[PDB]
Amino acid sequence: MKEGIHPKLVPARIICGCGNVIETYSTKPEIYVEVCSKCHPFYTGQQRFVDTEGRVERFQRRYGDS
């Protein structure tokens, strides 16, 4: 890497909906990540929260009782 012209890329800390990624090793140490998926909310480590498909599921249910 040519000497001049460069971000620092110095060891860091960092945060999320989870705890830390000690890994870091980036420019601009100590950053705040809004939420990740990995660390397993939101997709990975499937939460499947709020979950859909209820549209065929419902109309066949409220229907024949009424």
């Binding site: 890994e23 950053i31 990740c36 660390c39 990975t44």
Partner: protein, 181 residues
């Protein structure tokens, strides 16, 4: 730095899984991961190359390498384009610096994408490298959202010493690449 968690993760627990699966007479035959090349094409900045060096500043920030600048191969009418002008930035990272970026990409960036039911699994290029592309740059940690004057995405290319997509798929899965299956 030579430590870098993903690098580590690759050696203890990604390599051996891989050998168990395909099974490999040679230590070399088991896939390494070489070269993540990040390419921004910007027609966006065309007559204005002033906009450009702000975007280059941005790649550096998330890459830790300053990008070089691709200039136009031939001249083509329909969208402007003198054969002189700069089209985009392209930055090659390897070796540590690829790792320290791929980690960040896996554990921060891609999570922050609206929707994201996972990376497309057909983009393997048939000889076993993989490509994807991103719409916004603010999905990265080093970017503050107030430093974006305008959105520009990029093309990530990841080169792999695996001869096939199958193997290639395995490597990146095992590394923690979220896949839409």
């Amino acid at each position: 730095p030579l430590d870098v968690a993903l690098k580590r993760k690759y050696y203890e627990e990604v390599r051996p899984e891989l050998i168990r699966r395909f099974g490999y007479q040679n230590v070399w035959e088991v896939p390494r991961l070489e070269k993540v090349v990040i390419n921004q094409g910007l027609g966006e900045a065309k007559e204005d190359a002033r906009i450009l060096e702000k975007a280059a500043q941005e790649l550096a920030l998330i890459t830790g390498q300053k990008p070089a600048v691709t200039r136009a191969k031939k001249s083509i009418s329909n969208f402007k384009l003198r054969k002189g002008m700069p089209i985009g930035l392209r930055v090659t990272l390897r070796r540590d610096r690829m790792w320290i970026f791929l980690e960040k990409l896996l554990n921060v960036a891609l999570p922050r994408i609206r929707d994201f039911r996972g990376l497309n699994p057909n983009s393997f290029d048939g000889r076993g490298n993989y490509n994807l592309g991103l719409r916004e740059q603010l999905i990265f940690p080093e970017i503050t959202y107030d430093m974006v004057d305008a959105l520009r995405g990029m093309d990530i290319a990841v080169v792999t010493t695996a001869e096939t997509d199958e193997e290639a798929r395995a490597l990146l899965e095992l590394l923690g690449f979220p896949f839409r299956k």
